[PDB]
Design a protein around this ligand. Structure first.
Ligand SMILES: O=C(c1ccc(O)cc1)c1ccc(O)cc1O
Length: 208
C-alpha cells in the first residue's frame, strides 16, 4: 500500500529552485543533513531527561555516514527522535511553507543557497546532489515508514517492511551521476571537518 501526495506549491517551488539554480557549493547538503540529525538527537535527549523509557528503543545517540559505490548512495543515519507518519507527510516536521517564503525573501535581499538551513528547510538541500531521496523513520509513538521523492511535484509514503531501525531517521541519497565525489572517503572527511567539526554527537564514517 503506497500513498502518493502532492508537495504544497511552495515546497515544489523550493525543490525546483534547488535543482535548477546554478550553484557550485553543493557540499553544504551534508552539513544541513548532519544538522537535522543533531536537532533530532537533541529532541530525544531532552525527552529522555524526564522519561528515561524513551530510550528503550535505543540508548546510543549517534550519526553514521554510509557510502555505497555499487548502489551510488550516500546514507545519513541517526538515532534521533524520528518522525511520525503525520510529521513525515507534513514536510518532514518542518515549517516548509513559511520557511520557503522567508528563504525566498532572503535570496532577493542578498542571501545565497548555503543559508537554506537558517530557514528550517535544510533537508531539501539533499536535491543539490541527489536525483532521489528515500527517508526511513521510526518515532517511539508510531510505526516505521518510508518517504520517497524524485521531486517532480510528488512524494510517496509507505509502511517500511525493511530492516527495523529501533528509533531515528535514515536519509538515503541516490546521487546524480556527476556527484559521485560524495562517495569518496577523503571527500566526506573533508566536508565533515570543514562544516561539522563541533557537532555534539559521534559521527562515524563507514568504509567499504
Ligand atoms: O527525524 C528527524 C527530525 C528532525 C528534527 C526534528 O525536530 C524532529 C525529527 C530528521 C529529519 C530530517 C533529517 O535529515 C534527519 C532527521 O533525523
Amino acid at each position: 500500500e503506497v500513498e502518493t501526495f502532492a508537495f504544497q506549491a511552495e515546497i515544489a517551488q523550493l525543490m525546483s529552485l534547488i535543482i535548477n539554480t546554478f550553484y557550485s557549493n553543493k557540499e553544504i547538503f551534508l552539513r544541513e543533513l548532519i544538522s537535522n540529525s543533531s536537532d533530532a538527537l537533541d529532541k530525544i535527549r531532552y525527552e529522555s531527561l524526564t522519561d528515561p523509557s524513551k530510550l528503550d528503543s535505543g540508548k546510543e545517540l549517534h550519526i553514521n555516514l554510509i557510502p555505497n559505490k555499487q548502489d551510488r548512495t550516500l546514507t545519513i543515519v541517526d538515532t534521533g527522535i524520528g518522525m511520525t507518519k503525520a510529521d513525515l507527510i507534513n514536510n518532514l516536521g518542518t515549517i516548509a511553507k513559511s520557511g520557503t517564503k522567508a528563504f525566498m525573501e532572503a535570496l532577493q535581499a542578498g542571501a545565497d543557497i548555503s543559508m537554506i538551513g537558517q530557514f528550517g528547510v535544510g533537508f531539501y538541500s539533499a536535491y543539490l546532489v541527489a536525483e532521489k531521496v528515500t527517508v526511513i523513520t521510526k518515532h517511539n509513538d508510531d510505526e516505521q515508514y518510508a518517504w520517497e521523492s524524485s521531486a517532480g511535484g510528488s512524494f510517496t509514503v509507505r509502511t517500511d517492511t525493511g530492516e527495523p531501525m529501533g528509533r531515528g531517521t535514515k536519509v538515503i541519497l541516490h546521487l546524480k551521476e556527476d556527484q559521485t565525489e560524495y562517495l569518496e572517503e577523503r571527500r566526506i572527511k573533508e566536508i565533515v571537518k570543514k562544516h561539522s567539526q563541533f557537532i555534539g554527537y559521534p559521527i562515524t564514517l563507514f568504509v567499504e
